[PDB]
PDB file of C-alpha atoms in Angstrom:
ATOM      1  CA  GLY A 646     -20.180  26.881  -7.565  1.00 17.00           C
ATOM      2  CA  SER A 647     -21.204  23.071  -8.249  1.00 19.18           C
ATOM      3  CA  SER A 648     -24.654  21.447  -8.177  1.00 22.00           C
ATOM      4  CA  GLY A 649     -24.582  18.845  -5.639  1.00 22.22           C
ATOM      5  CA  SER A 650     -25.938  19.566  -1.921  1.00 21.42           C
ATOM      6  CA  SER A 651     -29.615  21.390  -3.176  1.00 20.86           C
ATOM      7  CA  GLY A 652     -31.697  19.739   0.177  1.00 19.05           C
ATOM      8  CA  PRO A 653     -31.785  16.842   2.595  1.00 20.31           C
ATOM      9  CA  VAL A 654     -32.559  13.649   2.001  1.00 18.04           C
ATOM     10  CA  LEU A 655     -30.361  12.931  -1.113  1.00 19.58           C
ATOM     11  CA  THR A 656     -30.664  10.267  -3.840  1.00 22.26           C
ATOM     12  CA  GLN A 657     -27.949   8.681  -2.337  1.00 19.49           C
ATOM     13  CA  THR A 658     -25.573   9.474   0.763  1.00 20.79           C
ATOM     14  CA  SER A 659     -23.597   6.537   2.377  1.00 21.32           C
ATOM     15  CA  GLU A 660     -19.861   6.038   2.808  1.00 22.37           C
ATOM     16  CA  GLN A 661     -18.928   2.595   3.066  1.00 24.39           C
ATOM     17  CA  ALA A 662     -15.717   1.001   3.303  1.00 25.30           C
ATOM     18  CA  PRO A 663     -12.752   1.151   0.181  1.00 26.32           C
ATOM     19  CA  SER A 664     -13.873  -1.542  -2.706  1.00 27.58           C
ATOM     20  CA  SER A 665     -10.496  -0.514  -4.359  1.00 26.80           C
ATOM     21  CA  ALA A 666      -7.390  -1.647  -4.522  1.00 28.27           C
ATOM     22  CA  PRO A 667      -4.233   1.158  -4.879  1.00 29.62           C
ATOM     23  CA  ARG A 668      -2.597   1.996  -7.519  1.00 26.77           C
ATOM     24  CA  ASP A 669       0.531   3.772  -8.488  1.00 26.19           C
ATOM     25  CA  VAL A 670       1.923   0.718  -6.139  1.00 28.81           C
ATOM     26  CA  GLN A 671       5.967   0.509  -6.935  1.00 29.23           C
ATOM     27  CA  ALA A 672       8.881   0.339  -5.111  1.00 26.93           C
ATOM     28  CA  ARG A 673      12.368   1.372  -5.950  1.00 25.30           C
ATOM     29  CA  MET A 674      15.315   0.960  -4.611  1.00 26.98           C
ATOM     30  CA  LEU A 675      17.475   3.887  -3.140  1.00 26.66           C
ATOM     31  CA  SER A 676      20.357   2.038  -1.224  1.00 27.89           C
ATOM     32  CA  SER A 677      21.829  -1.277  -0.546  1.00 27.77           C
ATOM     33  CA  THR A 678      19.539  -1.472   2.753  1.00 30.20           C
ATOM     34  CA  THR A 679      16.673   1.295   2.025  1.00 26.59           C
ATOM     35  CA  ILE A 680      13.601   1.332  -0.009  1.00 25.04           C
ATOM     36  CA  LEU A 681      10.762   2.898  -1.145  1.00 25.80           C
ATOM     37  CA  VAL A 682       7.118   2.408  -1.298  1.00 24.67           C
ATOM     38  CA  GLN A 683       4.781   4.785  -2.999  1.00 25.89           C
ATOM     39  CA  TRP A 684       1.270   4.739  -4.069  1.00 24.88           C
ATOM     40  CA  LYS A 685      -1.709   6.563  -4.856  1.00 27.03           C
ATOM     41  CA  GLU A 686      -5.378   6.723  -3.688  1.00 30.99           C
ATOM     42  CA  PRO A 687      -8.164   4.268  -4.517  1.00 31.55           C
ATOM     43  CA  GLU A 688     -11.043   5.034  -7.292  1.00 29.62           C
ATOM     44  CA  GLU A 689     -13.903   3.836  -4.928  1.00 28.39           C
ATOM     45  CA  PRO A 690     -13.064   5.436  -1.284  1.00 32.68           C
ATOM     46  CA  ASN A 691     -16.813   5.286  -0.311  1.00 33.73           C
ATOM     47  CA  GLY A 692     -15.744   7.757   2.860  1.00 32.07           C
ATOM     48  CA  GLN A 693     -12.958   9.592   4.050  1.00 31.94           C
ATOM     49  CA  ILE A 694      -9.719   7.783   4.140  1.00 34.04           C
ATOM     50  CA  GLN A 695      -7.769   7.440   7.521  1.00 34.28           C
ATOM     51  CA  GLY A 696      -4.632   5.682   6.342  1.00 33.34           C
ATOM     52  CA  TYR A 697      -2.958   2.593   4.597  1.00 33.80           C
ATOM     53  CA  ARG A 698      -1.997  -0.785   5.638  1.00 30.89           C
ATOM     54  CA  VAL A 699       1.586  -2.196   4.126  1.00 34.03           C
ATOM     55  CA  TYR A 700       2.668  -6.015   4.375  1.00 33.26           C
ATOM     56  CA  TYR A 701       6.610  -7.034   3.525  1.00 32.46           C
ATOM     57  CA  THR A 702       8.609  -9.998   5.133  1.00 32.06           C
ATOM     58  CA  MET A 703      11.213 -11.792   3.749  1.00 30.00           C
ATOM     59  CA  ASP A 704       9.280 -15.024   4.580  1.00 30.26           C
ATOM     60  CA  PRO A 705       6.360 -14.279   2.268  1.00 30.42           C
ATOM     61  CA  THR A 706       5.923 -18.231   2.670  1.00 29.17           C
ATOM     62  CA  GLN A 707       3.671 -17.698   6.058  1.00 31.64           C
ATOM     63  CA  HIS A 708       0.405 -15.835   5.728  1.00 33.16           C
ATOM     64  CA  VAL A 709      -0.057 -12.159   5.674  1.00 35.68           C
ATOM     65  CA  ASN A 710      -1.332 -11.965   9.391  1.00 40.57           C
ATOM     66  CA  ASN A 711       2.035 -13.017  10.258  1.00 43.41           C
ATOM     67  CA  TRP A 712       4.152 -10.816   8.098  1.00 40.33           C
ATOM     68  CA  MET A 713       5.918  -7.705   9.611  1.00 41.04           C
ATOM     69  CA  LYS A 714       3.651  -5.832   8.335  1.00 41.50           C
ATOM     70  CA  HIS A 715       3.774  -1.387   8.423  1.00 42.46           C
ATOM     71  CA  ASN A 716       1.865   1.328   9.534  1.00 42.40           C
ATOM     72  CA  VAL A 717       0.910   4.336   7.394  1.00 43.63           C
ATOM     73  CA  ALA A 718      -1.238   7.780   8.454  1.00 41.67           C
ATOM     74  CA  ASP A 719      -2.430   8.885   4.721  1.00 40.05           C
ATOM     75  CA  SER A 720       1.071   9.422   3.451  1.00 41.72           C
ATOM     76  CA  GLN A 721       0.665   7.543   0.440  1.00 43.89           C
ATOM     77  CA  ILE A 722       4.854   6.740   1.170  1.00 42.80           C
ATOM     78  CA  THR A 723       6.636   4.888   3.191  1.00 42.73           C
ATOM     79  CA  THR A 724      10.580   4.120   3.188  1.00 46.70           C
ATOM     80  CA  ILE A 725      11.030   1.051   4.830  1.00 42.43           C
ATOM     81  CA  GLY A 726      15.420   0.063   5.385  1.00 39.20           C
ATOM     82  CA  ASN A 727      17.521  -2.276   7.464  1.00 40.31           C
ATOM     83  CA  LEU A 728      17.000  -5.017   5.191  1.00 38.89           C
ATOM     84  CA  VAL A 729      19.210  -7.781   3.451  1.00 42.40           C
ATOM     85  CA  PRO A 730      20.664  -7.057   0.236  1.00 41.47           C
ATOM     86  CA  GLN A 731      20.775  -9.514  -2.576  1.00 39.33           C
ATOM     87  CA  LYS A 732      17.281 -10.794  -1.259  1.00 40.01           C
ATOM     88  CA  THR A 733      13.948 -10.831  -2.292  1.00 44.04           C
ATOM     89  CA  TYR A 734      11.014  -9.064  -0.505  1.00 43.77           C
ATOM     90  CA  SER A 735       7.397  -9.155  -0.940  1.00 43.94           C
ATOM     91  CA  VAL A 736       5.412  -5.996  -0.451  1.00 41.08           C
ATOM     92  CA  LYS A 737       1.472  -4.995  -0.409  1.00 38.97           C
ATOM     93  CA  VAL A 738      -0.898  -2.020  -0.049  1.00 37.76           C
ATOM     94  CA  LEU A 739      -4.338  -1.091   0.526  1.00 37.13           C
ATOM     95  CA  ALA A 740      -6.852   0.877   1.570  1.00 37.89           C
ATOM     96  CA  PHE A 741      -9.075   1.296   4.790  1.00 37.58           C
ATOM     97  CA  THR A 742     -11.850   3.734   5.806  1.00 37.25           C
ATOM     98  CA  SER A 743     -13.343   4.638   9.249  1.00 36.45           C
ATOM     99  CA  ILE A 744     -16.057   2.093   7.809  1.00 31.92           C
ATOM    100  CA  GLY A 745     -13.982  -1.128   7.310  1.00 33.31           C
ATOM    101  CA  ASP A 746     -11.023  -2.337   5.355  1.00 29.59           C
ATOM    102  CA  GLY A 747     -10.521  -2.694   1.557  1.00 28.17           C
ATOM    103  CA  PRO A 748      -9.005  -5.282  -0.995  1.00 28.83           C
ATOM    104  CA  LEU A 749      -5.200  -5.388  -1.283  1.00 26.13           C
ATOM    105  CA  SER A 750      -3.017  -4.792  -4.560  1.00 26.17           C
ATOM    106  CA  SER A 751      -1.353  -7.355  -6.972  1.00 27.96           C
ATOM    107  CA  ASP A 752       0.959  -8.964  -4.915  1.00 28.53           C
ATOM    108  CA  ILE A 753       4.982  -7.429  -5.949  1.00 31.70           C
ATOM    109  CA  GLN A 754       8.552  -8.699  -5.192  1.00 30.48           C
ATOM    110  CA  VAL A 755      11.578  -6.254  -5.383  1.00 28.52           C
ATOM    111  CA  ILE A 756      15.112  -7.357  -4.758  1.00 26.55           C
ATOM    112  CA  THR A 757      17.265  -5.371  -2.630  1.00 26.38           C
ATOM    113  CA  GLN A 758      20.084  -4.325  -5.443  1.00 26.16           C
ATOM    114  CA  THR A 759      22.013  -0.787  -5.715  1.00 26.88           C
ATOM    115  CA  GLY A 760      21.118   0.374  -9.173  1.00 23.86           C
ATOM    116  CA  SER A 761      19.136   3.187 -10.767  1.00 24.27           C
ATOM    117  CA  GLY A 762      18.033   4.720 -14.023  1.00 26.12           C
ATOM    118  CA  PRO A 763      15.986   3.295 -16.917  1.00 25.25           C
ATOM    119  CA  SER A 764      16.508  -0.785 -17.717  1.00 27.18           C
ATOM    120  CA  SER A 765      18.292  -1.257 -20.860  1.00 28.91           C
ATOM    121  CA  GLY A 766      19.016  -4.557 -23.279  1.00 28.94           C
TER     122      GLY A 766
END
């Protein structure tokens, strides 16, 4: 019972590409060669989200366009494995819609090491 669609020709009605980076982007190790990437939807979707794009590679020194990259279908969560322990790995996430693509998020770095729980000291 909310008011929003009174009649035709509204004050504003145009869905564009996502102009907001993904949040809650954090990578938590679960195994010796198995990670977990989870994030939340953007703040300014401006349209129905079709999915997302992830970027992870042992050699981040190269362009993200050359990175291994991953696939996503509106899951807000992806588990990557078959990696190497004791090795720094880069991870990135972004949002894209039928209109276009959106800006990436703050580049993060997670090391492949076993261990869970709250950090001490």
